[PDB]
Amino acid sequence: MELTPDQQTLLHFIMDSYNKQRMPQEITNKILKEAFSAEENFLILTEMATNHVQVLVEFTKKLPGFQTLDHEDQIALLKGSAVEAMFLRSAEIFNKKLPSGHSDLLEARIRNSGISDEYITPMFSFYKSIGELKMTQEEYALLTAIVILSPDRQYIKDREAVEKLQEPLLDVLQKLCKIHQPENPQHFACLLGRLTELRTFNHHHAEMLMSWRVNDHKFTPLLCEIWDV
Amino acid sequence: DHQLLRYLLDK
Ligand SMILES: O=C(NC1CCCCC1)[C@H](C1CCCCC1)n1c(-c2ccc(-c3nnn[nH]3)cc2)nc2ccccc21
Secondary structure, X not given: OOOOHHHHHHHHHHXXXXXXXXXXXXXXXXXXXXXXXXXXXXXXXXXXXXXXHHHHHHHHHOOOOHHHXXXXXXXXXXXXXXXXXXXXXXXXXXXXXXXXOHHHHHHHHHHOOOOOHHHHHHXXXXXXXXXXXXXXXXXXXXXXXXXXXXXXXXXXXOHHHHHHHHHHHHHHHHHHHHHHOOOOOOHHHHHHHHHHHHHHHHHOHHHHHHOOOOOOOOOOHHHHHHHOO | OXXXXXXXXXX
């Protein structure tokens, strides 16, 4: 029932890799410090996302067995997960406990950033529903690894090789849930259910980006490839 | 194509 020495090892190693990301406080201090125009916020988003993808690629290469997969399957797994991982990490940041009144200003700054009304509602519904789950740092790290190692991605040639890498992560996540929240037995199924919500963000992503209230939508060359814009 | 992605993954 408890984590085996192997599972604790995999867990601590996943956590250390995940924590090499840009710190939440760094992101929120900037946003909370002062109100920027839509033009400036779009520039902040593209620089944040470029750095996120760069760190995501590094975290992915350290996932056990990923480097043994077919080079074309590796590209499809990364391209297919980059948007979901950005929204999952943004939800983590959004839900970080801050001093009284700060998270309300954060929500106000994000609502007034330049994103269109059509995309604010599903975005905030996701962040709140993530918030209710009260996820630990390990749950966010394992869930990100599970999102990346999704065997059921379009343009994947060898699905079982991916399934074999994801299954030990699913098993660690389940045990973690059955220990951190014994009073909520659906917690594990409910985390996995939120992944189905993340997939919908990826399908309308190009449209969400182009509907930002700016005069010109400039992207970096790495984002052009990853976001298909 | 995805040449920047291919590069980052190989490197
Ligand atoms: O910087 C940010 N997100 C980074 C977080 C770390 C991983 C990489 C993305 C943006 C802010 C940009 C500047 C203006 C306010 C939002 N952000 C988002 C967010 C995310 C995507 C779109 C978007 N739009 N079109 N495609 N994606 C929009 C907003 N939600 C956040 C919740 C908490 C904290 C920051 C948040």
